[model samples]
Target chain A: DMYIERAGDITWEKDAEVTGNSPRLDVALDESGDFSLVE
Target chain B: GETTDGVYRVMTRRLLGSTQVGVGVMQEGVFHTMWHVTKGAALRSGEGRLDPYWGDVKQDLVSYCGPWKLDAAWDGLSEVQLLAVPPGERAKNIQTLPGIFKTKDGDIGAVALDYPAGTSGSPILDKCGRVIGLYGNGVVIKNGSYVSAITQGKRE
Candidate 1:
């Protein structure tokens, strides 16, 4: 009974803590199910 | 006499820095005499996703009892729960549902559904093979509808 929610854009920055442990991440969501991101 | 049967089960596990930190368990059992009445057709299946930041993750299968209905039992009687992580160092945990079901033989009655923790969404599948529910806050169901504000369509 669930439908699509809002989808948009996003931008992520890597802090010193995430340098080697995990990948730097960024994302966004709009009213639609569309999206954008960078690692 | 109207008859209904099915089984259901769910399990969760978590890991942190080489240490087992969390675990969740849920189960449900039911039996009804209104199965003779044909309610309707099955529900269309759908796809979804979950995005958690940190913690442990895994999936399990839910056991079912009786004749499987596409819409009435399978589709009409399904739901999902979502949780979010607060800004801090402590790991956040979310309990989704109180698994429930009915079945014929006690064997098929002991199935388990897999639930993964942390920064991920699980696709809620219907009898017709559609992605009905998506886990996580990005694409989630609040009250009784679906919303994609949680993942922002990141596909992670």
Candidate 2:
């Protein structure tokens, strides 16, 4: 389940580390700082 | 040997191929204390020396007395030298490594080590040890962290 992709100021936190069947993605930084992707 | 107030606490005897890599000493109980050493090898690249050991060796030892503050205690020790290569050749050898600072009227500042994020630079020292700035890529985990930069300035 693709979410987003944009690299520059560091904003990667997707899927939050999905488990069980793999397909993992976990990168964070979102409070206003942008860059989010959490299951 | 250990004495303390009279001064005779020399305890540093280990130098084989040399692998202590990290030990920043700075203890304050009555005054100051110091100890620092960082060693690493395998840096002669033309595509020949390749891996003597390739990257990572940090050292910082600081001791304080008084008058600099009011009573200080800033001890430090660090060790991490692992490399797998290919991060743009470790960010071009961590930007070259070197950094120093001491200004607030004390007069002394330096920088060098362009950051690509290999992380580990900036600790300018010059009492004869000679280090002017250029080591600060970033990565210490935690203990007063701030290391990452390839080129900074101020040494005049």
Candidate 3:
């Protein structure tokens, strides 16, 4: 079967939250479809 | 069918950023029977670390048609297709089955066991476009050896 590939409107530098550092792997996209670095 | 060596039953996901892939095992060849099939998916935790779960397990026809709490598919296959990203690392490369399964030397091969260019993983089909076996890393170098690789941590 064919897998569906969806392009997101993610802008790493901006869209991706930046807590103490950046690109923290521990954080997850919330059910509401939003993620925060400070979380 | 007595299929063995150089065949991976693989499946992959076309995610937003990059495509995720995994490998699977053969039940009885012929492309119908299958089990221990691993495919990539969205993280259950919703985290974006590129985590993979190999819970997909299936077998026979009825069993394959049934769904399990497995990873990719305990029964039936997905709409995923294997593709080769970067072909052999070295021209002399042999023995390494990329994108089908993991390599002993730690190479991911292709994403879905996509051979030729070593593109992608999961249950790799044959030239006849049927099920084979778990796809692994492409041995992008000729070391004069044939090592068949498969995925670890599988359950029924």
Candidate 4:
């Protein structure tokens, strides 16, 4: 990869079959700048 | 990924066999993005050959965090972030498949993987925030809930 992983011991295994739903993607926060998942 | 032993860093794509910038992963999305960060010298080289030059110095990462509410959706996920990586030991000789190199970092903090139509895009958390990985190779089951899919690239 042009990008190199240095910490976690994991590698790519590609996905052949595609799907519709791709799970929740994005981020958010409160007025105080607290991060959280976009529900 | 988070720090395992003496380090915490991010792993590059194994099949990164090209300079092609036509990947579908990066499109008109607020969060789903794939940015690049080359060693200063590497940038001067003006080439996208995945082979990194270690002499280019150490310590690197580009974390993206956008706005929320009147801004990003999907919660804070829209606000991207890239937990950087530090230099450590190597494990190149251990594996047969060449091209892909490995390094360690001081615990980014915590981190998972993927199979099937499961939770394929979960984030690995660290002290900074998100480690920028998909928890899809395997699921991180906690308290009986499929919290996230392992994006760190595990085969099991």
Q: Cα lDDT of all candidates, in order?
A: 0.21, 0.22, 0.25, 0.23
What lDDT is reached at residue A34 by model 3? 28
Q: Rank the candidates by DockQ, best first.
A: 4, 1, 3, 2
Tens-digit lDDT string for candidate 4 (A1-39): 333222333222132222212233233323331223343
lDDT of 4 by residue, B1-156 (tens): 111221122233334433222110111111121122222211111232222212111111112122110111122222222121223333111101101111122111112112222112223333233233422222233333222221231111
- Misplaced by over 4 Å in model 2 are A1-39, B1-39, B50-116, B119-131, B137-156
lDDT of 4 at A16: 20
Name the regions of candidate 3 deviating beyond 4 angstroms.
Answer: A1-39, B1-123, B137-156
B1-156 per-residue lDDT for model 3 (tens digits): 223322222334344443333222223322221222222232221222222323333221111222321233211122222212123231111122232322233322222122431222334323233333333432222333322222222235
Write model 1 residue lDDT over A1-39, tens digit each, in one string: 211111111111122111111111233433332322322
- TM-score of every candidate's chain A: 0.27, 0.19, 0.24, 0.29
- For each candidate in turn, the TM-score is 0.18, 0.19, 0.23, 0.19
Per-model DockQ:
0.02, 0.02, 0.02, 0.09
Q: What is candidate 3's lDDT per residue for A6-28, written digit by digit as tens?
A: 21111112122111101112222
* Alpha carbon deviation, residue B9, candidate 3 (Å): 14
In model 1, state the lDDT of residue B8.
Answer: 10
Superposed by TM-score, candidate 2 places the C-alpha of residue B80 at a distance from the truth, in angstroms, of 27
Higher TM-score: candidate 3 or 4?
Answer: 3
Quote the true-contact fraction of every model: 0.00, 0.00, 0.01, 0.14
lDDT per residue for candidate 2 within B1-156, as digits (tens), equals 111221111112244432222211111222111112122222111232211211222212122222111121111121111111122231111111122232222221223222233223223232222222233322222333333221222211
Question: Best-fitting candidate, measured by TM-score?
Answer: 3
Q: Return the number of clashes found in candidate 3.
A: 52
